[PDB]
Predict the 3D structure of the following.
Amino acid sequence: MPSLAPVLKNAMPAIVNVAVQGYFESIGSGVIIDPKNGIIITNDHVIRNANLITVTLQDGRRLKARLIGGDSETDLAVLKIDAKNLKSLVIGDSDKLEVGDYVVAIGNPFGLNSFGNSQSATFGIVSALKRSDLNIEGVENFIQTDAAINPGNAGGALVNAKGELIGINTAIISPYGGNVGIGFAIPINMAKDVAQQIIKFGSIHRGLMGIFVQHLTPELAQSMGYAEDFQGALVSQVNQNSPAQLAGLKSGDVIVQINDTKITQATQVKTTISLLRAGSTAKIKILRDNKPLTLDVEVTDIKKHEQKLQSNNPFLYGLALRNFEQESPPHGNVVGVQVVGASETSAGWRAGLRPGDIIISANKTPVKDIKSLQAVAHEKGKQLLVQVLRGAGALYLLII
Amino acid sequence: MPSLAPVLKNAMPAIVNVAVQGYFESIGSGVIIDPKNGIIITNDHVIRNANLITVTLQDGRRLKARLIGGDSETDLAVLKIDAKNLKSLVIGDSDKLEVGDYVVAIGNPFGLNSFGNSQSATFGIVSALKRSDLNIEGVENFIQTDAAINPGNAGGALVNAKGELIGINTAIISPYGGNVGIGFAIPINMAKDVAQQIIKFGSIHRGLMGIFVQHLTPELAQSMGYAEDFQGALVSQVNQNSPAQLAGLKSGDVIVQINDTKITQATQVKTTISLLRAGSTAKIKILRDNKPLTLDVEVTDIKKHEQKLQSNNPFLYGLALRNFEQESPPHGNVVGVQVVGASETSAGWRAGLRPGDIIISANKTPVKDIKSLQAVAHEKGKQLLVQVLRGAGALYLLII
Amino acid sequence: GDVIVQINDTKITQATQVKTTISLLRAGSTAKIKILRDNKPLTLDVEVTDIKKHEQKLQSNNPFLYGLALRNFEQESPPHGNVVGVQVVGASETSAGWRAGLRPGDIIISANKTPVKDIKSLQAVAHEKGKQLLVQVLRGAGALYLLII
């Protein structure tokens, strides 16, 4: 007989039961990645805010679990179980998945197996790949399956016909919270990378290139000189003083490949960079007009680069400024720069500077334009003193 | 072509439609077990409280159905149809089922086939086996399937890839009552046994061994001297004056096999005994410590055992008694037995004895403890006369 | 019945002063307590000990039954018949017993396959040291096996 029984026999031990207690009892599933060190993988939201987490095997053993690390962005987490005689599953290649491939989802939906010896298997094909824009997670590269995934199936395994592990069941789209044949799983290659990174450092340190990326439609590709069937990631903006700008990356460029990964659409860029660790160079392969180029862009920590940026310009950082000219009573003819916006973390905001203020003098020197203001700001003192107009009133502020 | 069409062709005639009218119209499905005598099987809850039940075949024939018997505990029922030229399907072995085997569920969901010629087939694998603790039915040994089972699928057939009958679709778990890929069917071996027992006696007469069973976890197994991977049904309690107690069964014993059926977990004991008929001996194979033993335990009707139990101790039966000593005004020093609880069926309760009462005298003889009370109870009279303390007051009661 | 009359330098004239005087003291430091037992003057040196530490010294002394309130129990309760053992009046959520799934109202009839008729007997079985103590309890009509580690 044509059956999935033999293959599923060799996969079920690897899938376990996770029980959670917090300040509140949550249940979910887990997969055993490395039976040697006894470490299992599951969804972050399962073990979120958890005092005690308990893992039960098909053996029937109940074991206290220790939390190595977790990542809210990709909804992944790694646990260590202090046990032996654990069994595991062969890991597979999610990048080789094709729509229409048969898959089985193994997990504990509705807490059905009290004793852990009977996980639930549900059967389906791969509906779609590389799902994004779902807004379920910060970083999404989902596998879409019509195999039945319900509450409690999270952290469960999604396996191909051979029984290799290709995904971790995460979320579903439902009008009423029950499975309607649409479910999502995190591809194992992405998931394994996150896990292996977690064990090594205890957390994921992520960086930004400071680039905005736009989907490249065929209509749009023609106007930029490319072929209709051309594919890639269009670069709409490269931010000011960003690692991308330093590398020489420009607007109108089309990202065609990042490192080993090849890029055919914009949504692929964010997922590729998210796996990369901060402080490490990323090889970006682009086409500027129709000329091939290769750029090495630093992937930089968010907080760290925000200090280098403040260091360059301490006083005026985090401020949106517009040149301002108006005849406003009782001030009379007013010429200076207006504070369109201020950052709550900025030196200006701390000083009491507010949006809508008009800066007329800095360090007792009249300011008629932004370029003049930046000059006075450029010369370095412990503090910059500014005089601003707030409504009918005026104020003196000290940016330290 | 790789299809289920040929096999389902030889299965669809066996599945029929059941229509019910009561005081209220209910619809469901049925399967034809014996075409010779024209007997069909279905869920008990379909034909519950039913004045007239009508069966329609794929032939298009509509037939009045007669109710042989039904069992609320396993939610099964047998119907006899007075017709000829009926077709049926080969019955199969549910015990040979494995998780991942392809199965099809045949029934009339939502009443879609008005004329009976087009049952609905739904395709899925076997999600799990031996489901229990669901608390849907009194006796549960369900097959879990992700094939689509909806209202009106009850009493329908669940068939393997060969087209053999392996289950009767019974219940689903859903947040909103629609199929979410989790559905349950009664394994055919169990269902066939119930049916054949019904045909023979018209009802199921069930008995209790008076034994409490606990799941044996590997952690728990070690401390009792067994292997970590050992499996069985731990005997937590053997009731007082029970058939199990007479046979010599004790706490700490592990049921490893009952009759032909081998036992690997606690939930299997209840389902196994449920099939057994009262007044029939059950062969119980246990391990006391690590020593193999065999005991033959009588499976006894509940009403009969409680009459043997009442006969043994007539007056004080159904009473929970605690030795009582207290200095309570206006009684002064009070010594006697206190009625912690009384059974509404008890001789004591009928006599007007209530919980909280303190028995200080029996048959004009002072009672200072339970053992003394039981002695006075042991000597036989048509009635036992007791003197009780009810609050500040006292009462004389006559227990017959 | 002893009367604290002075702690260290601070002299004590009413009860509320004891708590405030000790509250200032740092853990792991000896406190000089001056009392009157009946009408005879005495001086005692009492260790001021951390709460978490003392509760670890306390668990070590009695590992299995710590955090439990136990009462001797005798009752004739169907369907058990004559029941004699110790009843769990209360359990502490931090106790080894509570973790094992032991609940108040349970009646312990056996420990390590040995029948238990009273607290003194239970404490004896608990006193002999194993990694775990196995107990059999009565919960309502049912009975349960628990493993206290």
In short: The beta strands of chain C are 3-7, 10-11, 29-37, 40-48, 68-77, 81-91, 107-111, 114-115, 133-139, 142-148. Chain C touches chain B at residues 74-81, 110, 113, 132, 134, 136, 138, 142-145, 147 (CB under 8 Å). The helical segments of chain C are 16-24, 51-61, 96-99, 119-127.
